[PDB]
Amino acid sequence: MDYDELLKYYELHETIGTAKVKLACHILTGEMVAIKIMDKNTDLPRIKTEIEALKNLRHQHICQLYHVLETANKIFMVLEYCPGGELFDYIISQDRLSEEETRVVFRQIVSAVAYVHSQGYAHRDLKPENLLFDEYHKLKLIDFGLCAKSLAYAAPELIQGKSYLGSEADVWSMGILLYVLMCGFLPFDDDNVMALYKKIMRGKYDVPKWLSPSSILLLQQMLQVDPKKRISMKNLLNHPWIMQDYNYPVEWQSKNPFIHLDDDCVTELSVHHRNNRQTMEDLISLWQYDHLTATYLLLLAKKARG
């Protein structure tokens, strides 16, 4: 009953995570996808929150939603294939990243998060387990279930149950991410939850000898307990540390459109439909996140590889 519809469009491969995640192949294009499987009667608002955000967000550093399928018991989300693994696993594998490798990764995180804020959203659960590498070793932001329109990464105001601005909470989380990338351990860490809570509230952390003066200053600018003292996203885009070795601000605007359609992909898609080109373009432009949406976006991913 639950897998009947999904099997009309996808050939299932193995479970990789237990939401349960399955790898699969889109039958029509032959493209690999990841499928997130969530049970309705085992948080339903968290599923609807993520779906609503992903239907509205489309960006080179956000893991793309292709197709949404629903049954009485399950909701399936067909998503962009990211075989490079979690950033969390990558940092551990490397112990810690150099300042230069941290900047490569961090500029991509800044790009995705600045775009999310530009769209009127705040992620609210930024952490290395929520950033994946695709086949090109480019980062993709995942899990928009807690977004607004993990304790080690949470801003002090957010833990205290106080009112907060989502953008300020994201800037603090990005500061914790920045520290983890360059150190390979958390700035606030404890086995006891209350002792961790105390450490976050105090905002004091050890500064390893390998951190450069510029890294230390950026960390200080992001890790401010008072949210009004944290750096704004606008100032993060062209921060001196961010610009070092690059000399251009972070490109945060989306390169992945809703309006423009790719002519080659429209042609490839149209051969599978008993409709003219203009009818197919108008249907694609409705972005229903049905099989048509998945087919078009997967053909765009196939084109990108070549």
Ligand SMILES: O=C(NCc1ccccn1)c1ccc(-n2cc(-c3ccncc3)cn2)cc1
């Ligand atoms: O290791 C992977 N493949 C190679 C492989 C594995 C086993 C056997 C043979 N070859 C793989 C591929 C894709 C993924 N993705 C998870 C999400 C994802 C997106 C949104 N929310 C949660 C997860 C998107 N891609 C992970 C892992």
